[PDB]
């Protein structure tokens, strides 16, 4: 895949959907975690915003590499894909609006809920907002910040639980507090980086292009 993209930017706390068995052929799911940001062994615990006790793990957050090169997460709905095609599927965006223009991403798609078609990467930052599941209300009680957006401020990270903090700073740190930022991306080979904080590496990854910095 390659193209043109819109982005977002969330924290759900609900176990991302590449977390479940069997939506795409991959070494293993995306790791889900428990309410104390602790790995589960079982990859089909019920989401946290479905009821269940299966959350989004704090180390699928974003970091800058450098100061041109971040690496994360995103939910993604790729124009002619599926998650067959997508989960756990890593692509370099390259900003083409906003403070970040210029910048480079490499995220790896860990989850969907974009419209169909579009090209959507909502990009995982803690603090970027819960949406239509605050699954972080059932995890710890909530975080702060406006439903959709999140919080405003990066003194408002300061209330946040540990495991999350760094990548709720790395929002006003790296991405320049950048909103809805546009991108062009490559579908890439995974950062072995990523695939070590997400767990899954998809069975075709190396056809892909390596990434360069
Ligand atoms: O089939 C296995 C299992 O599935 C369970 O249902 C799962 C779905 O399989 C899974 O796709 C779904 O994933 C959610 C995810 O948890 C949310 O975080 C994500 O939210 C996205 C939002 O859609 C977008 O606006 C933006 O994309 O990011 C956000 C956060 O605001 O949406 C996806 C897709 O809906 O989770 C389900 C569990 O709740 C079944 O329940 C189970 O019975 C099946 O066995
Ligand atoms: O559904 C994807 C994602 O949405 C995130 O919220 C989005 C809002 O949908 C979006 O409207 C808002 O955009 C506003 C922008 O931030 C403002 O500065 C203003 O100028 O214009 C926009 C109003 O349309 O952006 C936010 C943040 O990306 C949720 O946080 C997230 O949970 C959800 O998954």
């Not at 989850?111 to 169909?116: N, V, Y």
């Not at 405003?152 to 950048?178: E, H, I, T, V, Y």
Request: one cysteine or more.
């Amino acid at each position: 895949a390659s193209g043109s993209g819109q982005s977002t930017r969330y924290w759900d706390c609900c176990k991302p959907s590449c977390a479940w068995p069997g939506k795409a052929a991959v070494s293993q799911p995306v790791y889900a975690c428990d309410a104390n940001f602790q790995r589960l062994s079982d990859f089909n615990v019920q989401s946290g915003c479905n009821g269940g006790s299966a959350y989004s793990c704090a180390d699928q957050t974003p970091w800058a590499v450098n100061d041109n090169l971040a690496y994360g997460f995103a939910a993604t709905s790729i124009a002619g894909g599926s998650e067959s095609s997508w989960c756990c599927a890593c692509y370099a965006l390259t900003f083409t609006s906003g403070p970040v223009a210029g910048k480079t991403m490499v995220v790896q798609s860990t989850s969907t809920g974009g419209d169909l078609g579009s090209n959507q990467f909502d990009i995982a930052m803690p603090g970027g907002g819960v949406g239509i599941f605050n699954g972080c209300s059932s995890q710890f009680g909530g975080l702060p910040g406006a439903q959709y957006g999140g919080i405003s401020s990066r003194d408002q990270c300061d209330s946040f639980p540990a495991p999350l903090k760094p990548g709720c700073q790395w929002r006003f740190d790296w991405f320049q507090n950048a909103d809805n930022p546009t991108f062009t991306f490559q579908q890439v080979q995974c950062p072995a980086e990523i695939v070590a904080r997400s767990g899954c590496k998809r069975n075709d990854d190396s056809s892909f292009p390596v990434f360069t910095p």
